[PDB]
Paper text:
Crystal structure determination of GPCRs and their complexes has been challenging due to their low expression levels, low stability in detergent micelles, and their recalcitrance to crystallization. In recent years, reports have been increasingly emerging about the successful structural determination by X-ray crystallography, owing to the development and the application of new techniques including protein fusion and the lipidic cubic phase (LCP) crystallization by which protein crystallogenesis occurs in a membrane-mimicking mesophase environment. Crystallographic studies of GPCRs, nevertheless, remain a significant challenge because even in LCP many GPCRs produce micrometer-sized crystals that are too small for study at synchrotron sources. SFX has a high potential for structure determination of challenging proteins such as GPCRs and other membrane proteins that often don’t form crystals of sufficient size for synchrotron data collection.
In this paper, we report the deposition of the XFEL data for the recently published SFX structure determination of a rhodopsin-arrestin complex (Data Citation 1) as well as further details of crystallization, data collection, structure solution and validation. This rhodopsin-arrestin crystal structure is the first GPCR-arrestin complex structure that reveals the mechanism of GPCR recruitment of arrestin for desensitizing G protein signaling and initiating the arrestin-mediated signaling cascade.
Residue numbers in the entry:
A (entry chain C): -159 to -149, -104 to 326, 1012 to 1339, 1343 to 1361
B (entry chain A): -159 to 326, 1012 to 1339, 1343 to 1361
Amino acid sequence: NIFEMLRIDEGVITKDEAEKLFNQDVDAAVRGILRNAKLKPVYDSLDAVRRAALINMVFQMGETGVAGFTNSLRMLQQKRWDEAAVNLAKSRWYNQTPNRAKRVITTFRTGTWDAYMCGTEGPNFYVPFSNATGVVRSPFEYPQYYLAEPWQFSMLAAYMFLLIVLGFPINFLTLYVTVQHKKLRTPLNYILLNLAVADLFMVLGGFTSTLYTSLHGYFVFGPTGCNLQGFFATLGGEIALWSLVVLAIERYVVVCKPMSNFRFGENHAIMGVAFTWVMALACAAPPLAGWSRYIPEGLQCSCGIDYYTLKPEVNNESFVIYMFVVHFTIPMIIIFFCYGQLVFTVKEAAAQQQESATTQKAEKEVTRMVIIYVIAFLICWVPYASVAFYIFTHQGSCFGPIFMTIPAFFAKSAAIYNPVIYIMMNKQFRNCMLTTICCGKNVIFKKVSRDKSVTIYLGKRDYVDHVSQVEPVDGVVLVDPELVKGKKVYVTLTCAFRYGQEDIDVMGLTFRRDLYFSRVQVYPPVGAMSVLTQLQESLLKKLGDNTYPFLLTFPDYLPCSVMLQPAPQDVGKSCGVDFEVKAFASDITDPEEDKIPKKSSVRLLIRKVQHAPPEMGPQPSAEASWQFFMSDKPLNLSVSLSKEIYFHGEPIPVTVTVTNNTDKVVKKIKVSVEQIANVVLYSSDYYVKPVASEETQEKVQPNSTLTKTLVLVPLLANNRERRGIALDGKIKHEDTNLASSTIIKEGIDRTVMGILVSYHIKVKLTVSGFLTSSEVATEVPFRLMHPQP
Amino acid sequence: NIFEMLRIDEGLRLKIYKDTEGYYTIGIGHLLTKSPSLNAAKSELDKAIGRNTNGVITKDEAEKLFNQDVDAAVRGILRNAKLKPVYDSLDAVRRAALINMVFQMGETGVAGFTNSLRMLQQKRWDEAAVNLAKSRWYNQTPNRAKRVITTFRTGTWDAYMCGTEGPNFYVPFSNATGVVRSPFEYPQYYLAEPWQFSMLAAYMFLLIVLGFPINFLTLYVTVQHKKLRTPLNYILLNLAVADLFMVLGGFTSTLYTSLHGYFVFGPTGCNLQGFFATLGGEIALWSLVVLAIERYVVVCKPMSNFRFGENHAIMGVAFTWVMALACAAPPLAGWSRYIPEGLQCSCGIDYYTLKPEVNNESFVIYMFVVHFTIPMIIIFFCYGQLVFTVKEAAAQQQESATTQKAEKEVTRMVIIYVIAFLICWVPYASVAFYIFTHQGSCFGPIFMTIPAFFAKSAAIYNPVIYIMMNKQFRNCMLTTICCGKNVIFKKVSRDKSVTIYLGKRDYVDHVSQVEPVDGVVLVDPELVKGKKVYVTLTCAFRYGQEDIDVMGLTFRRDLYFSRVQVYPPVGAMSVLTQLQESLLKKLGDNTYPFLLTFPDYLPCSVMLQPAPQDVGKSCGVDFEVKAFASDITDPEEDKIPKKSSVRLLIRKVQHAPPEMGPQPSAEASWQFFMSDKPLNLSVSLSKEIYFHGEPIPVTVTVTNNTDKVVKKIKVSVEQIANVVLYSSDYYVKPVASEETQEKVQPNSTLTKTLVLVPLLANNRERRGIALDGKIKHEDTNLASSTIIKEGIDRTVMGILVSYHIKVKLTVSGFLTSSEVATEVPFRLMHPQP
C-alpha cells in the first residue's frame, strides 16, 4: 500500500512512531492536493494506485514542485499514460533519482502494483535483492555473490562442515551402539532411536548438499535437487520434532501410571514412530505436490519451505497458517502439558515422603532436565516461528538474506544439541556409549556374598502380616574380621515397587519408586535391641564368634507382596511389589545407600503375606431393584453367598434369586468373579478384570420367580496367558496362586501405596427388551485368602 | 504208722490246752511245763519249735514235737529192765502199740503190767489182751484201749483203719461204734447232718435249673441260626453237649439219691452215673484244650483260617471224645473203679482208697499227671503265646485305637479263662495229691465234697464265660430269648443322604510315590443338620468269617486306617484336581472334595483263591473308601451307623516298571558222597520282568562231569506266597511245571530251553493260590509280584508275593534217586497302559 510504497522509495523514534509521522504527512499532503485547484481534479480522476504515486511526488518536491507540472497533469487527467511518462522521464526528477522515478513512472503507465517489487521474483525461486541495478541472475545457474560477502559463503561451508563432523558420528553411534547391546533395545528407546534416524536425514540429505552448494556459491543441482533436499531437510526436522512430542507423551503416561508400563509394548512404540512419520510426511509432502513449495532460502544455497513470498498459485498463506498453528502451537502445548504434569506429579510425590532422600535426588535431577528440555525446544523452533510471524504481519517491508539465515542457524543446530540432551545426557546411552567408544571396556537358611565376606542369615522368607501388628524380620549376619576391617556393615530392610526394565527406567529420567526402605547398623552396634529372640540365640550358639543379630520391623501402612502376570509373548515386561532384605559393608557413613559397591552386598527377598482372619465377616447378601423407560414395573433381584471370606481353590456358590414382575423377558443370567485391581503409586487408579465366569441359559418369564445357585471356581490355571492378572508375589520363578485380598488397618494416618486387590461377585442379567439389549447388573464383595496353617 | 496211731487216739491239738490233769500240754500229748504260768509253757515251746509260736504251731511242728517224744520215750523204754526185753522181742507194729501205752500212762503205768508183759514176751497174744482188758486202762479209755488191745492180738493195723472198706464202696467213717451200713441199701445219715443232705438236694436242683437251659439253648439256637454253624463253634457245641451229659447223667441222679440219703440205684447205677459224670467233665475239659489250640493257630496264622474246615473241627471233637473215653472207660473195665464219693450220694472215680485189685495208684498217677499237666501246659502256652503275640502286635501299631480296645478285651478274657480253669480243676487235683502224699491221715465226707462243689459248678460257669460272654452267641441268644426280636462313578447311601463320588477304582502304586484317592461327596442339608460328615480311608486285612472272628477273642487286623473330615471342613482343600473341579461344576452346591493319600509302607490288593467246595472260606487284603454321617466327634470311628454310611472298595495295583532289571542267570555246582566229581549247572532267562500270559523260556545248561546219570530235568514256575500279619510266614507253591524226558550222560553236556506258561485257568480249583484283588466276584489273574521301597523305616505287613523259576534235576544215583535243585527269581506284573 501507500505506506509500503514510500518506505521502499524514500527510505530516536520507533518504526511505528515514524509510521505515524508519515501518516501525518500523508494526511497533510492529501489536504494540500485537494487545496490546489490544479491537483484536486487529477487526484479525483485517478485511481487509488496512481493517487499514491501522485502523493509520492507531492511528498518530496512538495505542493510547489508538483503544481508546476502543466502538460503531465493534463495528460494524466485525460487518461494519456505514455506521453505523461515520456515527459516525466525526460525531466530533472528522473535524472535526480532514476531508481525511485523509474518505479513511479511505470506505475503511471500500467495502473497496477506490478512495478512495486521488493525483491526479484522468479519461476522456481525468490531472491531477496533488488534487480533495479541489473545484477540478479538465477540461483540454479549463476553465483549469488551479490547477496552477501564471499567470505560468508565460506562461513556457511565451514558451518555445514562442523554440523557433519558433529552430527553424523553422534547419531550413527547411537544406532551402532544399539545394534550391539541388547540392553538398549526397548519400546521407550524406539522413539529415541527414531530421533537418531531423523537427525541422520538432516545430515546426509540436508547439510552435505548445502555444503557442496555453499562452496560454489549457488544451488548447482537445480529445481529437482532443491525439492529433494528441502524434502529431506523438512522430513528430518519434523520427524525429530514429533519424536520429542511422542517422547513427552510416553514419559508422562508411563511414569505417572505404573500399569501402562505393561501396556506399552513394541506395537505401541511402533505406532508412536509411525505417527511421527505420518505427521512429518503430512507437512513435508504437500510442498512437492502443489500446496506451498521448496525454494532456495536466504543466501539461495539451502533449500527450505517458502514462508515469506506470498504466492497464491502454490497457496502459501494457508500452508504457513496450517504449519504455524498445528506444528508449532500444538507440540508446545502438548510438551509443556506433558513435562509440566510430570514435574507436578513428581514434586507432589517427593513432598509426600521427604524422609526418603533418594526421591529428592531424583526429583532434582528430573526438574533440571525438564527445564533444559524446554530451553532446547524453544531455542530450536521459536526463531523460525517468530520470523515467519513477523514476515507475515509486516509483508510490505523488505527482508535481507542474512535475516532468514538466523532461524536456520538455531534449527540446524538443534540437529546437533538435541542428541546431546536426549541421547548423550541420557544415563544409559552415556554408559553404553562409554563402553563402545573405549573399545569394549569402561529350617533356617542363609546367603553368602560374592566376595564371601558378609553372610546373611534368616529364619524364613514368608513373613506374616496380621491386621493389627506385622510379624518382624529376624536373623543374624556372619562377618569376616580380616576382610571387614575399618568398615561399617549395615543390615537393611527394603520394600520396593518395581515397574519396567531396571536399566531403561533408571537411566531415562527417574527410576522405580521405593514404598518403604529401612537402614540399620550391625557391626559394630551402638546397641539397639532390648532382648533377643530364640532364633538369634540358636544361631549365635551354632555359628562362631563373629555373628551379629538384627531385627527389622514393618510399619502398619505398607501393602502385601503382589506381582502382576505377564503374557507369554511379553518376554521383557515385569511389574510388581516385593520386599528385599539386604546386607552390605562400606567405608562410608549412613546416607551412602542408593549407589552400592556390588561385591560386598548380599540380598535375599521376603514376603509380607496376609492369612485369612479367624473372624469371618457377615454373610454377604446384596439386593437391588430396577425399572425401565416404558414399563414402570419393578424387577427385584437379590444375591446371596455362603461365606464372606472364601479361600483359594474353594467353590463359590452364588445363590441368585430373581423375582420378575415386569413385562420384559430376561435373556440369560451370567455370574462373574471379577477382581478389582486397584493400582496405587502416584494416583489412585482402579482396574477391574473378570477372573471366572459362568452363565445359565434359563429364562425368567413375566410374573414368574426363579431361584438358582451357580458355582464358580476361580483358578490361576484357567486364567493363564493373560495380561494384568494380579498374583501373589513369587519367591523365585516358582508356581503361585491368584493374588490375595488386601486388608487395610482401620483409621490409619498415611495413605496406603502399592498394588491393592479386592474381589467381588458380579451378577449381570441380559434382559431381552423391545434390537437393543438392556444389561442390568449388581455387585457384592468377598475375600480370597489363604487358610491359617 | 505210729504217728498215725497216736494222732487218731490222743488227738492232735495245735494250740496250747489244759489236759484232764490241768497242765500245759501241746500237740499230741506233748507236755510243756508244770508251772501255772502260760509264758513258761511258751518259753519251752518257743525254744523247742525255734520261733515266735505264741502257742500256735503247725501240724508238721506238732509232728516233730511228737517225734521227740517218740525218741525220748523209746530211750526210757530201753532204760527200764522190764520194758526193754519186751520191746526187743516184739515187732515194729507191736512196739508202736507199747509206745502208745507208754505215752499216756507213762513208764510208771506200763511198768506195773507183770502178767501181760510176760505173756507178750512169750508170744501169747490172747490172754495178754484178756489181762489188758481187765485193767484200769481199759476202764479209763475203752475207746482208745480197745483199738490198741486188738492191735496186740492181730499184729496188723486193722483197728487203725480210717474208714470202712467194702466190696463196691468206701465209707469215710469208723465202724468201731457199729453204725456203718451199705450205701446201696441203708441211709447214710451217720456221716453228716440230715439237713446237709437237703442242702445237696437244693444244690443239685440249682445245677439242673441253671445248667440244662443254658446248654440246651446253646444247641437250640444253633439249629435255628445258620450264622453260628461254623467249624470253630463245633468245639464250643461239643462243650454244650458235654455239660448236658453232666446234668442228665450226673446231677438228676445225684438229686434223687440225695433226697433219700443213700444211693438207691446200686452198683450198676453207680457205674453208669460215674461214667457219664466223668465223660461230661472230661469232654468239657479237652474241648477247652482244643479251643485253646484252635484259637492260637487260627488267630496268629491267617492262612489256617482256610485250612480249618468241618473235617479238622470234627477231628478236634473226635480227639476230645477219644481222650474222654480213654480215661472214662477203664474204671468200668478194671483199671480203677466208680464208687460213691463223699456222702456216698454222688458216684465218682476212686482216688483215695488204695486198692491194688483195681490198680488205683497207677490210675491216679496216669490221670493226674496226664489230664492235669497236659491241659495246663497246652492251654497256658496257647493263651500265653496268644496274648504275647497280640500285645507285641498292639505295640507295633499304637496309632490304631481299634486294636487297643481289642487287645484290652482279649487280655481281660484270657485272665478270666485261666481263673475259671484253675477254680474248676485245682480243688480235685490238690486234694487228690494231698490224699496220696498223706495216706495215713483221715479225710471226712464234707472234705471230699469241696472239690465236687467247684468242679460241678464249672458245668454252670464255663457256659457263661465260653458261650454266654461270647459276642456272637450273646447276640444270637438275645434274638431267641426275646422271641425273634432284639467315566466318573458314584455310590448312594441306604438312607440316601450322603453320596460318595470317585474317579476310578484302580489306583496305581508307583515304587516312589503312590497315586492318591481323589473325589467328592454330595450331602443333603436337611437330613445332615447339626451333624459331622467324615470321608475315611481304610486299609484292611481280612481273614475268616466276619461274625465268628469278632466273637472268638479279637477281630480282623487293619493294616492301615486314616479318617478325614468333610462337612464342615477346616477351611477348605488347598488346591483342587481337574476331577474335583469338574465334579463341583457338574454337581450342585452341596458338594465337598477330599484327597486321601497312601503311605509308602503298605502292600497291594491281593486275595487268596478258595476251592470250589470251600463255600464259606475267604482271606485277602483289600482297600475301602467309606463316607458317613455322625453326631459324635472324631474318635467315634470304632462304631458307625449302618444306614448313613456308604462304602466303595479300591485297589493299590502295581504296574511293571519301565526299565527291566538284569537278565537273570543263576549258576550252581554239586558234589556227591562217593563221587567227588563236579556237576556244573547254569540257568538263564530272557527277561527279569515277565508279564501275565507271556511265555517263559528257561534256557537250562547242564555240563555233566560226574559218573552218575541224570534221570530227568524238571522246571517249575513256583509262586512264593509270603504272608505277614503277626509273624513272617512264607508259603511256597508251584504254578506251572514242565519236564523233559532227556537224560544227560557222563562226560556229556546239554543245552535245552523249556518254555512255561503260568496261567490262572490251569491253576483253578486249588487252595492257597494268591490272586490279584477282585472288585466284585469277577474274573481276575494270578497275583502280581509285590515291590517294596528301598530302605524304609516300618515293616511291610500284608500278603507279599514273588515268583521264581525252580529247576530240579532228578539224578539217577546209586534204585535210589538224588534230587538236586536251584532257584532264580523273576517278576510277573501287568504292562503299562
